[PDB]
Amino acid sequence: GLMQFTLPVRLCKEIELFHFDIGPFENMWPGIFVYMVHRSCGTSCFELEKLCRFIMSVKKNYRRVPYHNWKHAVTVAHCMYAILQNNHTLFTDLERKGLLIACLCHDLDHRGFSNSYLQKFDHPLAALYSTSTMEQHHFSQTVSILQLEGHNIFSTLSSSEYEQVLEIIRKAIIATDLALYFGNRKQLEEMYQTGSLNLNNQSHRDRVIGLMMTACDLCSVTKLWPVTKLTANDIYAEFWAEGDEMKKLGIQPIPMMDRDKKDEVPQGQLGFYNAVAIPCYTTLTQILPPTEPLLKACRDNLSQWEKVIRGEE
Ligand SMILES: N#Cc1c(N)nc2ccccc2c1O[C@@H]1C=CCCC1
Ligand SMILES: [Mg+2]
Ligand SMILES: [Zn+2]
Asked: What residues sit in the active site?
């Protein structure tokens, strides 16, 4: 009850910043997450015995892949924590509970392959879920871990609050499917500009929560350059392995995923920053002004990639 998590001074201060890196000590990541829940939600939101048991079952069900791993989970939850903390009064008690859990669970049991590679492989999950394949699996895995004896962190919610939080978590996880992001942001853009955006409209909140999920999910591009640059290697290690598996199915993969065309990476990152990241954090900053530091950090890193291309690094 009176048991708080406390971090060392440096972390205690840096954790509040959007660009915080959770560090290379795996065994500190659960405490960092519980720290964030206690400050974000309250020391009462979850029974600490059950939260700790949920966190360690979630960790167990992330694989040892180069990027879509436990570190990503906690990193993406931290970005959500930063957004929620800089936007105190915009979110309900249920939304703060749900979204941190959504982010921790959003890539559960990821194998390091796109929905595209599952479809071309003819993976069983591609037959069970025709669209947002992995994301439907991630939500499924979340519900399974919640239903293990002693793991129901939401037990003390009423029936309707329980239904609401699981529905917040389902939409949040589905939205991390980047194929759905383009349309979601376009719609949010129009609604913002025509002035029809309304946070009392549930369908509008859903869309805004989805953009938040994309923003947390891509938050590697909003870190200090050395973190951004080193994470990019982890992302590309998966892409190139997927490229390899495409070649095993007798399919030339797009040049981004082909490990013979590494030269093309910096230009590939420009496309990604201009086509995805900058638009994402632009619309997010328009809807939630205090998330501006994400857009700024993302612009700083675009410029750093421009410098890589111009031979300057
Ligand atoms: N972050 C990031 C990131 C990145 N730095 N670079 C990319 C380049 C091309 C396509 C996707 C890219 C990407 O997308 C996430 C990584 C893997 C799949 C989920 C979306
Ligand atoms: Mg994902
Ligand atoms: Zn992710």
From this structure: 68
107 annotated among ligand-binding-site residues: yes
Q: What are the domain boundaries of the chain?
A: 28-310
Q: Identify the CATH assignment for 28-310 out of 1.10.1300.10, 1.10.3370.10, 1.10.760.10, 3.30.559.70.
A: 1.10.1300.10
Is position 123 annotated as part of the catalytic site?
A: no
The Cα 244–Cα 238 span in angstroms is 10
**Residue 278, Cβ density class (10 Å: 0-12 exposed, 13-18 middle, ≥19 buried):** middle
How remote is the CA of residue 55 from the centroid of ligand 2, in Å? Answer: 18
Determination approach: X-ray
Atom 5 of ligand 1: nearest residue by CA position? 232
Ligand 1 proximity of 221 Cβ (cutoff 6 Å): yes
Cα gap 164→131, rounded to integer Å: 23
Tell me the residues surrounding ligand 2 (ion) with CB < 5 Å. Answer: 107, 176
